[PDB]
Design an enzyme around this catalytic site. Sequence first.
Site: not given
Ligand SMILES: [Mg+2]
Lengths: 204, 144, 50, 98, 510, 190
Positions: F83, F96-97
Amino acid sequence: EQQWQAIIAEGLGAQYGDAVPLSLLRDELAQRLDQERISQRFLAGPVNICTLMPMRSIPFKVVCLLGMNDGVYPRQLAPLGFDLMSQKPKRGDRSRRDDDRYLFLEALISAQQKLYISYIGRSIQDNSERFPSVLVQELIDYIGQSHYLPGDEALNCDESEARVKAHLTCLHTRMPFDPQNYQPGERQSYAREWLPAASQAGKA
Amino acid sequence: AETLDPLRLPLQGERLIEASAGTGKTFTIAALYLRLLLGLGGSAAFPRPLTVEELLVVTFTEAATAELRGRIRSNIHELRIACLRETTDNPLYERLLEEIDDKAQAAQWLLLAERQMDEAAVFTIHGFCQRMLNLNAFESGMLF
Amino acid sequence: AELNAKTLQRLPGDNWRVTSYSGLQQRGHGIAQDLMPRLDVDAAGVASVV
Amino acid sequence: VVEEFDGYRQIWRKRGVMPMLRALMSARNIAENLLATAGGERRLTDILHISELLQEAGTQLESEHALVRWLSQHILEPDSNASSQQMRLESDKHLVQI
Amino acid sequence: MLRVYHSNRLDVLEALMEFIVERERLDDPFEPEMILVQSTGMAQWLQMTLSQKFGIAANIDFPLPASFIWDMFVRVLPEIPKESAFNKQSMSWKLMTLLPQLLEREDFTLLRHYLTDDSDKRKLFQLSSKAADLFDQYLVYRPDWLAQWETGHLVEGLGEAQAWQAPLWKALVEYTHQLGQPRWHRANLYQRFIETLESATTCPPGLPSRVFICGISALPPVYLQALQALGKHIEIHLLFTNPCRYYWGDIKDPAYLAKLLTRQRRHSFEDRELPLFRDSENAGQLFNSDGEQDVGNPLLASWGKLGRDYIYLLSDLESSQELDAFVDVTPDNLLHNIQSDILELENRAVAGVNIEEFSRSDNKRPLDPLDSSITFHVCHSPQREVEVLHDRLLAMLEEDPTLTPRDIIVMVADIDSYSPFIQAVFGSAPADRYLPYAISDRRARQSHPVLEAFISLLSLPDSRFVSEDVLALLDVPVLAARFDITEEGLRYLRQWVNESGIRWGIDDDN
Amino acid sequence: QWEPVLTEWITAVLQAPLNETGVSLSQLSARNKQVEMEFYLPISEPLIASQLDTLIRQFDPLSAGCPPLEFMQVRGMLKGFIDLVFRHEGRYYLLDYKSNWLGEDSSAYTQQAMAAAMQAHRYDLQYQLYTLALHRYLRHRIADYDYEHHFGGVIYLFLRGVDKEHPQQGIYTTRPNAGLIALMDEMFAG
Ligand SMILES: [Mg+2]
């Protein structure tokens, strides 16, 4: 949802303010769904089975070609009829016919070890003769004219060409349960499913 | 009625040909196609030689269409080989070579025609109507 | 004449493959990764958001 | 037998229509007994053609029951002008032709 | 500088790209590598090869040539929008509005009769799309046509359709001005970008260090002019797969043939020059009076139309440097014989015009009977064709141990037509006689039932509401799960709808 | 009607503190950010779940808490999407989401609950593979690269858990051990 959003965004980009019926967006969506194609498993690792894509030439050890009957390949696309470019050709122009005619040569030269070509010669319904594409015909004609089979030196060029072209064409059986398939030779089948039927060993 | 001769048939205006059973109308069709490609016949010949795309053939069924297309391709190839060698065993090709003035130009034209065989305008009635409606959507008014 | 079909002495192996973390861990997704390459496959199984 | 037909339905759901008919014919030796019976070659050719047509149709259908409905609809009213529905040649051997 | 690499096989060009990446590297890690490819599979193969050699392949972008050119336009020239106001999508919705106003004019009379029939605006939308496609093609290939149409003059010696196409486009150039959208497009940007690059003393900031073009065998001439202008500032590497070793393109004039003869290709690593033609003194004999060269090999002559124009346009570049990566192909097999004939630009086919040449066949090359490099197979049906292909692939795998399923590729003219037979034949195979396969390039609409079902739901207003259709809607599992209807309950519902009297129609209003 | 809330929901994410350093998304410049980086990782030797789990369990306590991994033997390429990759003060990070709906209340988005959430979905192997990929990329691209000098750790951001009042909720930070990364690299190589 993404295709719908993209269609409506392309419509709003031009600032179209008039009313739009549902049938228009429906047909647009139905066409865009047909236009999009999936190629995420092209080199996944299993054998690749896909169509001939222009400008895509990758070296492969075994390159096989199916559906090369007359009228099927090359794929034909006709101009609109009011295209000024189509009336006066110029260097650098692109047509689908030339694209396919060059894809055939790309597939010919891309084969590293083995090249396989197949087409429908006989109709299954009427047992009538069908002809292959013009490109495959030119290829087999060039192969026959260029080479000669051993022991054919005495003969003339036409007989040697005919003999060579007959040596490379393999006509298979019409039904999978045909006994001719289950004989020692080049076309011996690996499917023992039809072996019992071929042996004609059964009870009425 | 007059006994038909493929070499002397005038390719002008409207002509009606009656081919009885066993006469082999496909042979006459191929001979006329070769004449139209090469423009042979003198006064009976067409004013200008025509390409493969310009020549139009209408067939009854798909199987007859494919058969005639393949036979026309084969006859074009054989006539080109005969023009190159200048000696043919077939009588029709021999008469054609007799009518031909320059064999090298005819061989080049036949090579181009053989290379344009995939674009041959040999269709059925429905396919011809569909293609004519597509090419002229403005005049006919049909959808694209 | 006697008719015998050929046998395969060697069996082709499916060991070599190109995989992703989602396909390696999550089996339930199926072909969802093929349709959308960048689909947020981390969250699945929608609930009542009435 | 119920478990066998359940396995056939699983094969139908997973691989397709013709992969199920292939296994059904192989397990019960349908083609062998048909070819053994007098006149069974025509029946076997018809079965294979119908299997191919069913595969082509189920390829472009929403559900599996839709294929059964399509087959029933084609059976109730058949089309003779369609080239695909035309019966194939019974045998490739040299026989008396009618 | 602009560098053009020629090689018969793509592997040598890929190895040269790997070597170039290994020698020099980008200073900033966030700066992404640029590679120009038109197909997605080509990008996938390039990524796989780079990751296999270097050990990783990340931060690599694969933009289309047109998108890359527009990005360079945005970067170099000032006050340019990110997205062009003139594109295939927006021009359709703009002409959909512009056409009814222009219908009144005499010039559009032919269009007028066409727009009288439709009542649901289908013809208008189809005409707008078909006109926006041709306008995009003219933006790409014919900038002078649009530049002349904008002023109001007509091109001399053109088609009759121009009479109705020249004003419309002009009106478009005016209409987008009324809405306030940016005036700039590709045709106006081309010459200004070229002049700005030519008159620049130093390289402008923000440009990528090096650009790679690979897998693209056809490019527009204006894009080649822009790339030649851009090469002077930033390095560009063109990897072109050339089937023939020698120059097989046509020439414009004998003066062009002279400067073409002057040009020579240097070796990649051996530092030895190589002429373009096999015989420099007899090079003028090959070309015709019109300027069209006669290709030695008939197959390359017939199928080489596309690459001929591309190599002729590549040879026109003045400041471009050229190199040769060609690899000889030993003629030990039939396929190798054909490939060597294509490579060396020679025709081994005997015409037989002479009596001695026709009588004997020793002139031809001897063929091996056991050789199976090129084989032709005749089948009766596509089902039989795939059933034979499966056994042939199994035999090929049993023959060669090193051969793997990934190495084999099968191409069909129509993938959608053969997909059912492919799936059936490959799935009916047993466990031991199994071959893993994968299908690509299939239409997305036929991928999932839900996609097909939704399309049908969009047609609710214009529907007769037949009972069987509503029941087939329930046949879908996700739809039945939404309304909490099972299969056992579906049977009772079917029976009750059959015996209740429901035939068609949802209510009296419908 | 989601306009007034979502906007605020965005701001709390931009003005939140990711780690001990206090670096924030808002501070990062356009040149210091890379969005949705795609990477291919080659696997030369077959990968076995048992050996990989045995190697991973000792170095990471989260993996020690998790049940053993199970997957088929794979040999080929690994595809991955990252991400966000950003560098702060000369040290690179990984972000990271996660849009997963952990719970209906804020207590479900606490650090202790986020640990069990990471355990349930097996995101540990995910961020470990992402660290291996980022390490190989920084080693290849940078001439003078050291894992200890140029790596900052892994950050998982649960968008719904993020709250302006509570800094700890919605963020999960963890840096894998260098020896574990080296052993995983040696395992993937040969
Ligand atoms: Mg993600």
